[PDB]
Design a protein around this ligand. Sequence first.
Ligand SMILES: Nc1cncn1[C@@H]1O[C@H](COP(=O)(O)O)[C@@H](O)[C@H]1O
Ligand SMILES: Nc1cncn1[C@@H]1O[C@H](COP(=O)(O)O)[C@@H](O)[C@H]1O
Ligand SMILES: Nc1cncn1[C@@H]1O[C@H](COP(=O)(O)O)[C@@H](O)[C@H]1O
Ligand SMILES: Nc1cncn1[C@@H]1O[C@H](COP(=O)(O)O)[C@@H](O)[C@H]1O
Lengths: 160, 160, 160, 160, 160, 160, 160, 160
Amino acid sequence: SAPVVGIIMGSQSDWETMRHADALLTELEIPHETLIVSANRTPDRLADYARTAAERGLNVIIAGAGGAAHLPGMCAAWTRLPVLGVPVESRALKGMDSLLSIVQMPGGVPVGTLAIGASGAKNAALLAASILALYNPALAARLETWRALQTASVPNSPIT
Amino acid sequence: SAPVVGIIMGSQSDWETMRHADALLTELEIPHETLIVSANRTPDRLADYARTAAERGLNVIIAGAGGAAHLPGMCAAWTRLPVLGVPVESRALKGMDSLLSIVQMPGGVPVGTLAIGASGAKNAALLAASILALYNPALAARLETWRALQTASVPNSPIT
Amino acid sequence: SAPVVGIIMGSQSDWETMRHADALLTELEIPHETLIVSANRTPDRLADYARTAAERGLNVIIAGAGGAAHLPGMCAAWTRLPVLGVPVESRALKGMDSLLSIVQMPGGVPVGTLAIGASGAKNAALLAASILALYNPALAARLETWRALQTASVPNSPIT
Amino acid sequence: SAPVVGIIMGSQSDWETMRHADALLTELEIPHETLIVSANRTPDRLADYARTAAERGLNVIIAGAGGAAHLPGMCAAWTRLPVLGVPVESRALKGMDSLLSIVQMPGGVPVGTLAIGASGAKNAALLAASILALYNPALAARLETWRALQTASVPNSPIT
Amino acid sequence: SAPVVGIIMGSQSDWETMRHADALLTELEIPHETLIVSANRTPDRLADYARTAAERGLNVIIAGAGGAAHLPGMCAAWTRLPVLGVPVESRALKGMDSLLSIVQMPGGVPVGTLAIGASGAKNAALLAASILALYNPALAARLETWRALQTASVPNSPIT
Amino acid sequence: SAPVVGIIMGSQSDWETMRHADALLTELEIPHETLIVSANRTPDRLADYARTAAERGLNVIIAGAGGAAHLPGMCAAWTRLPVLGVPVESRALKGMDSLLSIVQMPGGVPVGTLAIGASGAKNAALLAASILALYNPALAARLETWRALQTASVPNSPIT
Amino acid sequence: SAPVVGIIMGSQSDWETMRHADALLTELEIPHETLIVSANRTPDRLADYARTAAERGLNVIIAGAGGAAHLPGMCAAWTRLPVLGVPVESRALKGMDSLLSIVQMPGGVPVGTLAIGASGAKNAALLAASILALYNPALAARLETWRALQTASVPNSPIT
Amino acid sequence: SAPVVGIIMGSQSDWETMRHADALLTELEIPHETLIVSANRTPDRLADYARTAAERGLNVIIAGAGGAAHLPGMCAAWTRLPVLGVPVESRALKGMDSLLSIVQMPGGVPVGTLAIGASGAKNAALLAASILALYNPALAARLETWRALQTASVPNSPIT
Ligand SMILES: Nc1cncn1[C@@H]1O[C@H](COP(=O)(O)O)[C@@H](O)[C@H]1O
Ligand SMILES: Nc1cncn1[C@@H]1O[C@H](COP(=O)(O)O)[C@@H](O)[C@H]1O
Ligand SMILES: Nc1cncn1[C@@H]1O[C@H](COP(=O)(O)O)[C@@H](O)[C@H]1O
Ligand SMILES: Nc1cncn1[C@@H]1O[C@H](COP(=O)(O)O)[C@@H](O)[C@H]1O
């Protein structure tokens, strides 16, 4: 019941995107916590969260942010845990500012970055699942089943 | 010892970039294999490689490619293992084509994407290490040491 | 009556674009088949389709995909037949991810790429027609008539 | 023997790129002509070239140009033959201007567009070859051999 | 009463943009003609128009086109007259394909290019006016008055 | 003879580009002046230059600048003369910043924009020439000769 | 009561963006003036404003402009005062033309540039406040309180 | 004398760019410190630096970084002082990633952003100087002299 994945996001407005990560973790029965933390506006909240993540038993952090998106990278700055980053789509620049701000991390501080938007959120949860599955046979079985079902459920011909 | 990470790249011309992933894993004493696999030129080789990766004992796959860079996403299409993607800098579009073709994967098929170029390659190895560290206390401590040395070694002022 | 062109697409959502290719082939009386196949989500379905296309009598493949668009390129990986690729417009990046993922193929594995969206679908069908017309006089006549009609039907002055 | 493919390019400065199409066609023993034709500097030369291509026995035209790169689309405007387009890498915008001016052709006037640069040129020749192969069993077998050698020749591991 | 400016455009859909050029010329009492001509779809219509523009008494050509926009550049290919180009905004790429296709002309064949969209159309008409004003004192006076009025009519403080 | 075209540029570093405009005007025997004027570093110099250009007898102004490139638009803000703009290629953004800051002028204040770099500079001179040619039969014939020599001199085939 | 910050903007249409700067200055009790001034369309109005800003007691200028945005840079050309620039979002290019036109100033003429749109306007006011706070203890206290309140008011968990 | 400006940069590789800020401040005799601070590699060093800057007597902070470039925004997150940001030109994306990650800061946390590269660094120092000049008449006069010399020193014509 203790959380092994932490989903953090810069704002309430990010939740429409990051909820897709929450739903997938819940679907695969992965205990997790979901929080709002801003690198730019609550930096000390972020420092506290990220420094203590490992000792709190977290295994993977999923961080979503838009614009000058610094939350995933600064989370990675303070934790040794794998951090996955989700670029939240921005109004003007359609998430390109989000993407480059997250993916272009300097050598030495990784953020595993996923697609702009909801797809990216879903994939960050799936990527966290596959990480956790390495050591968790029951979850690995659940994940296999999920992937196989996705593949089997793709239609064979279009509907007009 | 048997490899627990696979580094695969689209061609020999990717090696100047992907060697940084190789060097990093070796530094942290993570057993790994380093291979050329082309999604487009050797599709069956990729299918076989990715489908059998888990049974062979691999835990993480690091895939690098330039241009349209199908390799990391197609690898992730065939394995349940976490796949990390390194966009290799191409002549014309500077790795922006590679970045988009790797990071914009559909929901259901994650690639954890790192920066364009040598830094991304290094970070892919470090991200793989942080994943393995979750289950390997000795590696986790070596990783902690690596990160501590990085932080401690940054100079306080620039040299002329 | 046997299909000589295969239209494949990553998803039902791609059909609003790819239907324009279907309609044009039907208009020019080119027997064809229309299928949903995903490189990223049904890779084995794609391998089967692409490996057997030639022996099934197909002459040209039209492949439509959006995002990290790998369907046309991976189709080309497994068939010797000409593959034409249609970038499906994406939400955030307006089909630029689709375009670069499709057109920037490595030397040795061509995909003939058309415009983003419906225009591209129409043109992929027309391009397939012109390919088939090389050996098919009746189709060549139909194609000439079609092109000439298009040109004659362009208005000479704007309506307010 | 009489040419069945025309390679045309906007200027001498395109030759460093377009020679790769020339070399490929020669390797596969496809009779062809190689010419400089500028849409903007020699418009009548282009009109004549493209209008008469089919009657002269050409089956496919490969057109390369940089900058605004009007040549491939304007060629396609005047011939019913398949036209394949190679964006040549320009100094300032790295072939992105060429790519867009070639690939974004309106519905009705296809250009099958290949990658920016030397790889695109090579692939334009290979795509032309796969088109001709549909009606020429001996070439089809030579093309099969070429593709098989490409696949078989990719190394298994990188060299240092 | 004979036209001294020719406004040409690729399609009826371009008219919503190019009508702004028509209105401004009419406002400044510059006799002009307004036509639909497509470089890609009516190339022979374009050749005829452009080759004969000068002998028909035209002084300036304003050409509007979107997408793989070749109309202004090909018009310039066939006339010695100044050609001004207006990038029509495109759906997916917001007129960036239009812009680069028009402005990036090779040395030797100028197109004076204006802003994407309606502003560009207005400015192409104003630019044509300033060209014609060089030799036409009455028009020069009308143009001065127009510019001065624009400047005087800019408000001094915002309305809430 | 008194200058009828002014070439102005943002700084000495623009000269490598803008000399091509100078050389072209000289070739066509168009009297002109060539100056450095910075919108941002010498704003009063620009105001004076542009406000007095017409009274001094200038007919066309060619303005080149890199980076934010305020020079051509601000020149057009102060003169009623046609202003032609040359985006100079900057180190970082390759003249894309210059292109946008020149071409996206508001309705009311035209800059006729040419390609990025040396070709744009050449074409700015040629466009200025075609403007002057409307009122100068001897120049019009020299321009016709120039254009005819350009067309006639393009080789028919590439040299190795 | 005398203004110490001047907010200027190119047009009424810019006010929906720049009003956010006005509101924040008023909130922090910073006396200011708010005007419409266009670099491109009222250059002499701008020269007058900018040359006299310092002697009128202004300390900071906030300038908002869209498109070929020259207002902030030309303001900086004529004043020694710090000029902050706000890129107003544009229709086609989503404020990217605005951004590059403002931020890419030549060495020697700074404009401190803020985010595209309303956020940028708010931040230009906050940046001006922090500048003024250096010498104004009461404002510094007000600013601290404002920042602290922002940070304390960020929610801790998302609402569904 | 005690520093009143801090120049901080992400790494030694930024120094080639950021030295231009250092040189400028020295030229204007503005006491300053010049340091390496990495948001991602030395997050605690940055927190300490930025939180204590004001109490240490700093008035302005100039921060430069390349790639994802978290340094300027995270610095601004922890200090109430004005923070000026210099995007450093990166190999792959030419400083466009840095520009977006610096300039697109959320409302509430300003970074005054300057041009990409050496010119931006110079301008960051000049902007800092214009801020300090508001309270320091002797510096204000030195700055006036600097700006006057810049304007007066621009040549009237280019040298060959
Ligand atoms: N896209 C792709 C598929 N297989 C290899 N590539 C990429 O093609 C680029 C050029 O490879 P080569 O030098 O062999 O042509 C490399 O970046 C490599 O990843
Ligand atoms: N756009 C165009 C029209 N005719 C030739 N070009 C292109 O202009 C570029 C520069 O050619 P040149 O070196 O002759 O100036 C080349 O890439 C060539 O395709
Ligand atoms: N934007 C601008 C204003 N005045 C000159 N520039 C431009 O600044 C760039 C660099 O100039 P410099 O080498 O003098 O720093 C040049 O392209 C020049 O047009
Ligand atoms: N993003 C970032 C965080 N800390 C330093 N960097 C940046 O990483 C780039 C490469 O630094 P290095 O050469 O040390 O790898 C530099 O531009 C530096 O600002």
